[PDB]
Design an enzyme around this catalytic site. Structure first.
Site, mmCIF file in Angstrom:
data_model
loop_
_atom_site.group_PDB
_atom_site.id
_atom_site.type_symbol
_atom_site.label_atom_id
_atom_site.label_comp_id
_atom_site.label_asym_id
_atom_site.label_seq_id
_atom_site.Cartn_x
_atom_site.Cartn_y
_atom_site.Cartn_z
ATOM 1 N N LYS A 203 0.865 -1.039 0.055
ATOM 2 C CA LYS A 203 0.025 0.069 0.087
ATOM 3 C C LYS A 203 0.732 1.189 0.085
ATOM 4 C CE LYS A 203 -4.091 -1.094 0.053
ATOM 5 N NZ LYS A 203 -4.493 -1.809 1.098
ATOM 6 N N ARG A 237 -3.925 -10.610 3.488
ATOM 7 C CA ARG A 237 -4.065 -10.605 2.293
ATOM 8 C C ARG A 237 -3.072 -9.987 1.391
ATOM 9 N NH1 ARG A 237 -5.325 -6.662 -0.915
ATOM 10 N NH2 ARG A 237 -6.847 -6.833 -2.803
HETATM 11 N N1 LIG Z 1 -7.983 -3.558 -2.164
HETATM 12 C C1 LIG Z 1 -8.659 -4.623 -0.926
HETATM 13 N N2 LIG Z 1 -9.669 -5.237 -1.280
HETATM 14 N N3 LIG Z 1 -10.202 -6.214 -0.186
HETATM 15 C C2 LIG Z 1 -9.762 -6.192 0.929
HETATM 16 N N4 LIG Z 1 -10.360 -7.156 1.939
HETATM 17 C C3 LIG Z 1 -8.515 -5.385 1.350
HETATM 18 N N5 LIG Z 1 -7.855 -5.009 2.509
HETATM 19 C C4 LIG Z 1 -6.926 -4.268 2.126
HETATM 20 N N6 LIG Z 1 -6.958 -3.719 0.851
HETATM 21 C C5 LIG Z 1 -8.164 -4.471 0.233
#
Ligand SMILES: Nc1nnc(N)c2[nH]cnc12
Ligand SMILES: Nc1nnc(N)c2[nH]cnc12
Lengths: 257, 257
Positions: A203, A237
């Site tokens: 990020k 993730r």
């Molecule tokens: N971009 C994302 N999509 N789904 C998620 N669960 C996220 N957590 C941090 N960024 C994201």
């Protein structure tokens, strides 16, 4: 210890044995084939779930983009698939096409009807903190509050507790120092009593701290993921699955999970 | 906050601003030249101190091996140098040759006279936990005890408190699960009130956990180094300085140091 299991149609994710890894995924033949290749590559090097997502950095399209993706990978990589949408009708089609977990960046705020979709298929839902603005009386108090309204929406919709995962939404509606500071107080979401997923893969605020472009953010993703697990969260993730899978087993070993 | 500084003849290491990185170093012309090259490379990519060490994995030789190393690098890389010995006369020669911090894997037990050498030149000393055996009534209690006898030896020798750093000696006189478990309770050494250095760079128990040979232990070193800093330690001693320097600034940012 949790005393329940994350059930996902055909698959089951025990939540005590180890930190579960979510691999981020990057209807012609070329796309559906770079994706099956890449999903495979992630199964091969540690992932526990595949997340098929719009890049976020029209409705009819999302279906068309994403339905094909799922059909193929679910049929080809034997792992539970999460669909990364915030639209209801999209999510509808995706489980419908095969995907097992939902994953919503608007924590049911942007499209309330989505939550019902979950209740309906009994699919675990991820609820991410988010807001159309970003000025807080108090960050942590305020995001725990917000998350609580998501849960409320989920519950009033019929969603069982056991299908509910939270995510602090690091990266969204947050200044760089605000992100960091949530990072420091991750432990707090614990008091709401649900499994937490952290999502911090390359990020911008890693960029901000380290001063480094997206493809140089693998060590910073590292730090977030560890300090994540050591504040007790249940999934991460991530993009770089070889490397994170290993920092995870290490942390696990050390904090003893 | 510490309210003192790590003074090292010409150099000063504030201990609040950031976690300090120690780069591990791997009298003809070829060796003294791969070493100046490599010391340089480490200054270039984040190190805060160079550690010139025998590989540990006769007395007259150590001097001959190591004196040349120091003369060159101190004259060529402008950073404080720590000498990694446990022999007194060796350490004698090394500060004598130019090195600023001592670094002793036998925490003054193997050669008590070393401690006096420190008192004498006022050079900060690292004292590592170690023991000729490895059966403990209780690991953490027992290593805090042991470390305390090192400090005792240091102090009776004239060493000022402010020159004293401890290191839990992860890797030594420790079963694999024992190492891990010290890892989990790092915070405890804090109660002795000295700066702590962690030394875990590609050690065997990462190998043990991850199942992976020395050159594949960079993510596990990662995890140790983070969970290290998040349990509050002041240096990390490491091989892979590009990568660790970055996980350190990340952790720093997040835990706010
Ligand atoms: N971009 C994302 N999509 N789904 C998620 N669960 C996220 N957590 C941090 N960024 C994201
Ligand atoms: N080999 C080592 N030498 N000096 C140190 N201070 C260490 N800490 C962990 N391993 C070591």
């Amino acid at each position: 210890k949790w005393d329940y299991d994350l059930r996902c149609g055909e698959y089951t994710l025990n939540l005590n044995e180890k930190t579960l890894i979510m691999g981020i995924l990057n209807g012609s033949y070329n796309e559906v084939d770079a994706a099956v290749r890449h999903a495979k590559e992630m199964r091969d090097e540690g992932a526990h779930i595949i997340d098929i997502g719009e890049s976020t950095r029209s409705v009819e399209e999302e279906i068309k983009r994403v339905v094909p993706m799922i059909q193929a990978v679910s049929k080809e990589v034997k792992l539970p698939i999460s669909i990364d949408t915030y639209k209801a009708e999209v999510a509808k089609q995706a489980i419908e096409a095969g995907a097992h977990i939902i994953n919503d960046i608007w924590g049911a705020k942007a499209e309330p009807k989505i939550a019902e979709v979950a209740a309906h298929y009994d699919v675990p839902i991820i609820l991410m903190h988010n807001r159309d603005n970003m000025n807080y009386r108090n960050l942590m108090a305020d995001m725990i509050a917000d998350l609580y309204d998501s849960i409320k929406i989920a519950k009033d919709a019929g969603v069982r507790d056991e299908n509910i995962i939270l995510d602090p939404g690091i990266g969204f509606a947050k200044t760089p120092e605000q992100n960091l500071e949530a990072m420091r107080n991750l432990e707090q979401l614990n008091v709401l009593g649900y499994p937490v997923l952290l999502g911090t893969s390359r990020k911008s605020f890693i960029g901000h701290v380290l001063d480094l472009p997206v493809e140089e953010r693998l060590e910073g993703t590292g730090a977030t993921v560890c300090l994540g697990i050591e504040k007790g969260c249940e999934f991460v993730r991530v993009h770089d699955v070889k490397e994170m899978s290993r920092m995870a087993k290490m942390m696990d070993a050390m904090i003893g999970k």
